[PDB]
A paper describes a structure:
R2 retrotransposons are sequence-specific mobile elements that insert to the tandemly repeated 28S ribosomal RNA (rRNA) precursor gene locus (the rDNA) and are found within the genomes of multicellular animals including insects, crustaceans, and nonmammalian vertebrates. Here, we report high-resolution cryo–electron microscopy structures of two vertebrate A-clade R2 proteins at the initiation of target-primed reverse transcription and after cDNA synthesis and second-strand nicking. The shared R2p core domains include the RT fingers and palm motifs (colored as RT domain) followed by the Thumb, a Linker, the C-terminal zinc-knuckle (ZnK), and the restriction-like endonuclease domain (RLE).
For comparison to the avian R2s used in PRINT, we identified R2s outside of Aves but within the Reptilia phylogenetic group that gave rise to Aves. We chose R2p from the big-headed turtle Platysternon megacephalum (PlaMe) for additional study based on its robust biochemical activities as purified recombinant protein (described below). PlaMe ZnF3 also makes a contact with the phosphate backbone of base G-237 at the junction of hinge and pseudoknot. TaGu has a Spacer of ~80 amino acids that could not be resolved in our cryo-EM map, whereas PlaMe has a Spacer of only ~30 amino acids that we partially observe in our structure in contact with the RT core.
Author numbering: 1 to 265, 280 to 1121
Amino acid sequence: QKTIIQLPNDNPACPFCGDHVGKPSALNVHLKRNHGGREVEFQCSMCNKADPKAHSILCHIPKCKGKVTEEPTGDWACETCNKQFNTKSGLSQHKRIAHPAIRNQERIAASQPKPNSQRGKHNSCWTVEEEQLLAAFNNMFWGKKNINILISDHIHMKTAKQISEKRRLLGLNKNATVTTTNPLPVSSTCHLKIRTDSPNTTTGLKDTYMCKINENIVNQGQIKFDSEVISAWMAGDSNIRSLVESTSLDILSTFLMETPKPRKKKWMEKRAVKKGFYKRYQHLFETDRCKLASIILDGTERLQCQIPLTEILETYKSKWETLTPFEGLGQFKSHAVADNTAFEILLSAKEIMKNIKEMNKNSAPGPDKVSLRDLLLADPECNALEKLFNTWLITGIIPNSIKECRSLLIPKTADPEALKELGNWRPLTIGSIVLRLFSRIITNRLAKACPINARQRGFIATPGCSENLKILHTIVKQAKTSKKSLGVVFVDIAKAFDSVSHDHIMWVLQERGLDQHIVNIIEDSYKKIHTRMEVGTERTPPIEIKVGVKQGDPMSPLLFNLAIDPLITALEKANTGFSYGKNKITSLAFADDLVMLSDTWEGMNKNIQILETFCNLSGLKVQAKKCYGFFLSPTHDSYTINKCDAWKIDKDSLNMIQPGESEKYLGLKVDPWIGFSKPVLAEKLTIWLKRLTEAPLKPSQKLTMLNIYTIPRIIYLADHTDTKKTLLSSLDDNIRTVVKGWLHLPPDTCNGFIYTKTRDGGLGVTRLASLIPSIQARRLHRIATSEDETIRNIAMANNIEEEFQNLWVTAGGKKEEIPRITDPVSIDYRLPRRILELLNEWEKPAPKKMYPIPCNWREAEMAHWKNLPCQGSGIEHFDNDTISNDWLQFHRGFSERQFLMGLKIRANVYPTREYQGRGRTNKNVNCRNCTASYESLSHILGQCPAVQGARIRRHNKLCSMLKREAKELKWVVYEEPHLHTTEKELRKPDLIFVKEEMALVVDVTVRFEYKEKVFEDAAAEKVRHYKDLTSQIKELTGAKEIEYFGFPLGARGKWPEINEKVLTALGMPDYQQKRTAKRFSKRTLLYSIDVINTFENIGKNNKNNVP
DNA sequence: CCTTAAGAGAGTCATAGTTACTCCCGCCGTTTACCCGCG
DNA sequence: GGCATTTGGCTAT
RNA sequence: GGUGGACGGGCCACCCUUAACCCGGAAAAGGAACAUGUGUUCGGAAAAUAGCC
DNA sequence: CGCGGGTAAACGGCGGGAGTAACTATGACTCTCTTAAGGTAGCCAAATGCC
Ligand SMILES: Cc1cn([C@H]2C[C@H](O)[C@@H](COP(=O)(O)OP(=O)(O)OP(=O)(O)O)O2)c(=O)[nH]c1=O
Ligand SMILES: [Mg+2]
Ligand SMILES: [Zn+2]
Ligand SMILES: [Zn+2]
Ligand SMILES: [Zn+2]
Ligand SMILES: [Zn+2]
């Protein structure tokens, strides 16, 4: 098993090779060095406490107190895990926390009264057999002449008065005939068809279009359209379809560019495999690295459907081409009438450009082989696109030559065994990008035209999952707290987009009110769509999409939401929801995943009835295998869970959730016992960091991948689950240790360096303990100020003002700064007010609500870093500097060793003698190859004579570089010209530049960053140094003007702006000045690294080569 | 060719907050089970 | 005319 | 003590042919699958609606 | 049989005091410190929208 090394041990011997390598830290290093892959653990010898990390046990030993393992003896023992407690309440608490199901069963048992004694001592000597016989006889003797006869005497030893008594127990006047149970048919939502004629005026949009086009023709307006086609359309042309098809074909042929041809630019040794892997990863790093992040983090390269193409063709022919019966939704109504005014204002090129800018730039093309890039290249002003889309909109036609689309299969499950079956493959359908853009524009217009029920949080402007998750959690929490019964059900529509019949969407776009013109446009957009599916290298014959909505067309989400809206509206109208105060919420929704809420079990029965009726009518099917639910009946002291019977969705037992069980919801793990199951963030984080560690992903690339691709995945779950600061801090320690291992930074490296952003000089590593609270506060503010009055009321009533205040304080905000959660939130539009008011609302970029941040925690990290006397000296120089910190983010030309050494230098944690002896009193910190008292980076790079040569070399090289720049800008250069002042001294200026008349005297110095004035003082020194050479300089060059600005350069890469003034005096343009400044910074840092390497070799390597 | 100084985080255990309940006490209100008048 | 302005990820479905 | 295991720290194998390896500041196919020893591939594969950082 | 009206005691439903297991959050302290090579060139971070 896992080998164990026990401490305290001054010089433990490794369990695998038995080498006395040193202290337990050195032993751990050696174990990771020569014994990787083999598990080791460290143990507390006096206490048998195990931990993989040696330092944990090392710090524990002093705190340890003998043999600390005695169990907490107590006469109340837990049945399952056998823990002992000294009080019944304590044992019940343990069973509650650890065994939620057992505690729930105990709660229900306590609730079940079962005293068999709730009478009141008034029970008599009546016999059950006599009771039953009297029951039968009076059923026989119902107020019919001679009504006692038998009753009086047949019951021997009784009186008719006793008969009256027992009847008064059961039946009062008579006996008790037992007849109970509720009625089944209580929905009645399948009648009263309403469709009579066109919802809106049949020419409601056609009349407006004719008026607008007449105005455009008369006044020669800017509305664009082919004259002949709209002229024929006005004239009632019979063959408008062919003519518009021809005009389309022409414009598309203009768009159907000859798209640029691809311009993308023993003997058995396993070395090849390794090389290949490295090559692959590095290539994916150089090219798109979202795929690299997916491959590494997820571990799945890419999953393709191995199912035979014949089977796929058969299934999708029987699915897409096969129709289903439709009859209308009956009483199911959808919110309210549709607003046709949204379809006024014909499409303008500005609107098309706005929509394109909001699309995905890198979208794969359809069968047209036309991408967004090509669309913009052909029509950068979108005038041709405006003409085409206006023609289609006015004529209500969409050419069939563009309907052709290509399909594909996507793995919707991560388990390859599940992927074996075809049911776990999602069919995507990608049409011509022109069609995608037109459908997106019509989708925006429709979304404004048809208002969806507010409870539908999917595919709308509100933040969806955040609102639904918070509302569900708060609903359950309030039900637990206020002793109100709650019943929750989670329902998913099967084949949401592939099972929605075109006739159903048409019906929804009927009496809703949508203009018949737009209804015709929609029907056309899903008429004669051919989607020949392609798998691997083989493509199926054409398949005619006659059922469902293309999974990938921009209008499909909106059409599905419109199709579902009657269901959500009916559920809301049923008023069976959770009675949250005066109002009551009935169903949260997100696309197809909808959760129904109720106040009683029978209320959820009614909701299930409504859902079943809707699924029967619309044709959508709800599978009971992915539907969950639970009930929260309350007790005196607490709540029971699932005390009632299971639900009967579609005549099948709904999968109820027991305490401790967790069924996922919007990526969460809703658990009836504790709301959301606490996510496994430590486990996922450890897995991801291990995957990154063991990849051909050189430390800098590892850090880039971590920062840019790993953290967000955990960010979502960490923020949406209330995640406390302690767990986030533990995750932060894990990430910090792993990152330091990647970059070989010593464990004691300042946290500020790790957490300050790359632009600020740090590594740009996210601090979860300081970011997740900020995101949480912002999310609470967003939910508080949501557009849904229901969500507002629900959340406000749960006193989330205090929660938001606590999160604001926790994130680092100030009590005073706390915004009033009810105050309006500033909205920005990324355009000037004049420009905004210059255009209509269809061309207006979507407004973005700006929510305040509790504090710039990165600024706090930088402030902490500066306060450190040793690991933050002179680090204010790199603050908010975009030049000196460029290399941290663009380090091509830095060898990985060079980049890591630069990180160490910048963080002031380079292992020098001063750093090695830092803190300890009994550890020499003198200079190893010199007599300086302290072996710091400043001395090593600026004072030690040992590296004198290297230092000179660095200076000289930098001078040469500047000279080269001056040569490029056509300046005559004099290098190190001897000059003796009036005092007959030796003053050499590094560079003398001559052009036209004026001459420039530039001296280059490289100074370590310690204090702000340092560079200023260097420049002054040079200014205070040459001066007196004025006359001499003239005689050397004949110049008429001379200047004496110096050229200081940061030893660690700082670029003072006085150097920018030097360059401006040189006449360099601003952008080239920025390029030169970045190049300098990087090259100065590289030469300082060279000096450090020369120092390291001096002495050490001298002794090694020469003992 | 240029500088003075020199912990800092990792880590555990102790103790207090606090979450979401559990236990018990006791009182007031509801239920149960006959009684009486009774046409 | 450069200038300037911006380039990235993730989650849900 | 010398070589081999791409290179370095090990650790192994041979005494030149080379079975397996761990870690790395090193590592851009002597692999896998086609095409008959020599070429290719060894996909950037994947769409949409919203939100969040 | 049906018709009401009275009935009054466990017990259960609830207000509230008293605990409490086990997280969660700081506070008070201690422990940690030599991983592994040598050279050379030092570059890639640009592309793109508007102007
Ligand atoms: C996951 C996903 C969903 N969607 C859309 C299309 C779906 O119809 C809709 C809901 O998705 P799902 O409900 O996750 O898919 P489904 O219900 O059709 O699968 P199943 O029958 O097994 O339950 O969201 C996408 O467009 N792209 C995606 O990647
Ligand atoms: Mg579904
Ligand atoms: Zn060992
Ligand atoms: Zn111990
Ligand atoms: Zn237990
Ligand atoms: Zn020295």
